[PDB]
Every structure is written in C-alpha cells, then in structure tokens.
Amino acid sequence: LEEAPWPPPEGAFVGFVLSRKEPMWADLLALAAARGGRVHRAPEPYKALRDLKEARGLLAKDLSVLALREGLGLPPGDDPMLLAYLLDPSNTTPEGVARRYGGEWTEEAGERAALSERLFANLWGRLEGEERLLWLYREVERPLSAVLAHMEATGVRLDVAYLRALSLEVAEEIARLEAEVFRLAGHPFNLNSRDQLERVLFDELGLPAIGKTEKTGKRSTSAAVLEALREAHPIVEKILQYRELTKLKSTYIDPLPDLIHPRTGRLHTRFNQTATATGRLSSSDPNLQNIPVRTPLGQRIRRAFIAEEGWLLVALDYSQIELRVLAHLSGDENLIRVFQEGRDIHTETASWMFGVPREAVDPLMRRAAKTINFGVLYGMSAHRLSQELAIPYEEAQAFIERYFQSFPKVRAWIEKTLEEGRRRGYVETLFGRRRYVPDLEARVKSVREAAERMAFNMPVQGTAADLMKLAMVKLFPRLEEMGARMLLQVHDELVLEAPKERAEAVARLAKEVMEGVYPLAVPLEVEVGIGEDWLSAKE
C-alpha cells in the first residue's frame, strides 16, 4: 500500500502489536491503520490511540480493553474475527482466518491493519444473504464486544491476605496427607506424578486396574478409578483428599493473588468471544468461569471474590436453562407443562437418586442430579449411568426409558436435528448460529455417534448462550445509568457490582431484563442474590 502519515481518516481499520496476549498487562508496541488504499503507521502508539474514534479490525476488543486501561473510551467496532466466527465457529484464531480468507497474520501493525481491511471486505461479502448471521453480528456479537471490553477492564476485587493465609493452612494439611501416603506406600515418591502413582497402586500394591488412558494406554489413576478402589485399600482415600487440595492450591489459592493489577488493584480476566463451537464465551488468563464451589474448601476460595467497599455483589443465574430451551426447541407439550407448573427437575432427580424427599434435598445433592439429567439427555449410556449411581444396570436403563417417554417429542427433535445436519452439514441454534458437523455421516460408528452427540447438543447449549449474550447487550446500558458494573459471565450466570443503596434495585431490574430477553414457550426464571462475596450472593 501507499504509506501515508498518521493520523488515518475516519472508519479506518486498525492493526496493533502487544508485548503479550493479555491486554490489561500488555505494552502497546505498535499501532497502524489502513483505509482507501493507504496505510498509516503511528510514531508513538500510545498517544496515537487518542486520535481513533473506534477500534475497527482484528481483535478489536483487545485494543479497546487496553485503551480503557489508559482512561480512554475507545469502543470496539467491526472485527473480521466475529464475522468468521459466525460463518463457522471453528474460525477461532486470526492465523486460521487470515489463511482461509486471503491474507497472512504477521507481527507488524501495518500489515495487520491492511489484513483487517482485506479480511473484512471478503468476510462481509460472504455474509450478504445470510440475514440471520448478519442479525447475530449487528445485534449480538458486535455490541457484545463492547460490553466484554468494559467487563475485562473493570475486573473483580479479591481478598488477597485471606487467600495467602489460606494457602499456609492448606499447605500444612497437604503435608499430613502426603506423609501418610508415603508411609502407606512404604517409601516416598512424587505423588504429583501419575506415572509414579500408577506403579505404586497397581504394581507394588496389588490393586486392580479399572481402565486405561486414551492416548498412551497407561493404567488410569483418575478419580473415577480411585473412587472405585476406595475400599480396596486405605491409601486410596487419602490420595483423593491429596488430589482435591493440591488441585485447589496450585490452580486458585496460589496463582490468583499474584495476578492483581498494580493500577486497578483488582483481578482481570479475558472473555474470549470466538473460542467455542457452540457460541458460548470462554474465560482465560485467568479463567474465572471455573472458580470452585463444590467442596467446603472450594467455597472458602469463592468467598475471596468480594465487592469493593460500599458496594455489593449481585449474582443472577438462569433456572434449569438448557432444559427450558429444550422445551422451546422441541415443542414437547409435557416438558413445557413442567416449567409452567414451576417444577424443578434437578431437585426431583436428586430426590430419586438419594431416596430423600424434596424438602430434604441439600444444594450439594441437587448438583449431582445435573450430571444425570444432562448426561442422559445428551446421550449417556445405560452402563455408565448404572456405574455412576452405584445401582444395577436394569434400573439405570429404566431411568432412561422413563426420562424420554415423559417427553416424547424430544427424540423426534433430536432425530430431525441430526437429519437436518446430515443434509446441510451444520446444525443451528434458535437464532441461526451454526456449527458444522461433517462427521454425522462417518462410516466409523464411534466417530459418527460422537458427532451426533456434539451435533444435537449445540442447538441447546448455543441457544442458551445466545439468550445470555443478548441479555448482556440489553442489560449493560441500564446498569451504566444506575452506576452499577457488570463483572463476570459464567455461561448462564452474571455477577454484577452495585452501590449498596442501589443494590436491591439493580437486582430487580437485572432479573427482569434476563427473563424477558426473548420470550419462549416456557418462562425463564432467574435466581438472584446479593452479598459481600460471590458465595454469599448465590444464596
């Protein structure tokens, strides 16, 4: 292109180079812009940001986050990645997109600006006529990128000293467990090495091997295997407690305090918008979509996520979301009725599983029902179900027969979805988000049946993900007008931060927005809670 001087005319496509992938931690090494056959390279990239009215180009949200970090309101606009991601959600990285639609992703801001321009022209062209995908782009993904940029730049407060103290406590408990494991093994070894543990359990000790690993065919030491060996030897019980504690310590307790941002004093994740095959978001660096909650220790970790002084956290979580979506997508009269009568299937399966009435179901029991209810729905085998619930085989088969007869039109929808996917090569959500599944006609059974379970899962999970994204787009402006903040999204959950005096009003309004985002044949119920910490806010 013809190199022209900075600044660029309005509407130009930006290219930028970061010192590291995390925009909140990155140094802006270079900045450029392309438009009208010209390329504009900025002398000083930081001051050159102030000249742009919009981040338009590849990975636009990342540059918008860095601008917010510097106190600049530079919103993200068009991004070829979002167009490619809607065309085919396997388009997840700029390296692939560039190769597939006419360019090369280099490490130079100018070339990245020119690439953004060329890729947008070609991808925008491939989308004309795909009115449903364009609707998703204009009404969901492009507006959503702006919401996510603000979430990423805002961050969440964390009780550092609390986790620091917790680490020392867990460390002492880990030493007690590993000391008994070594004694029981007769000698010490690296208990973190599953290869070394394999020998101790199955070679030195006489324990039987329950299963093999996928890629290398070693004797597995997974929780499901150790759980099956729980009575075969006392050492097994302690290895499971050792695994729980080292998992939480090495993944959450120790790394998270070291990630507080020096300017903000808060913890900043990244919400990746083109990372999943179903339309869900993902979270990384750090992932805040898998903070513990199951075990008592996991709850102590979740308590570390707190509200700023004078504020409160507001947590909103859709009820039985993918089951409600299934009712709407399938049209099953019976399942619709279940939610019109305010029934809760997780609680019901839980009572069934545990031989305990609804009133006596605790939060932990209900969680176990989710694996069952969603396991069965998405193709779980009778054999495994029997093994998970520790009950005979015929009983497990009976649960699955009862499950689907209760809602006959589900299997009809599954079959229509698969037949539709074989003819067109893709399945779609309620809004037209597509996932290509070419293995539906594979002539290897395992490969084909795997494709089938991914295929008919995507419309359900992806529709729920669509609803949440749309709700986030509608809610964000209402929160700014109330002086509240959107902090985290966990698939079907939102965590907000609100001034104490407006916390209750924010909770009400956020609940209404999420429930009336897009009415279905069943009502969307949202559970909401308020508290000083994340755990308190979901009760």
Add this chain to the structure above:
DNA sequence: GACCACGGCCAC
C-alpha cells in the same frame, strides 16, 4: 527459557 502432549480436574 519456550514449547508440546498427556492425564487429570475445576466450572457451566
């Protein structure tokens, strides 16, 4: 140091 595959495991 930077990768990588793998087994394993946290969440939805």
Add this chain to the structure above:
DNA sequence: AACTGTGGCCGTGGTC
C-alpha cells in the same frame, strides 16, 4: 474408563 456435551489450567515428562 466411558458409549453426556462446552471450556481452560494444572504438573509431569519430554523436546528444542
């Protein structure tokens, strides 16, 4: 184990 699905991060063991 996996013959529910969607993710990302850990330590180990290995290569460069």
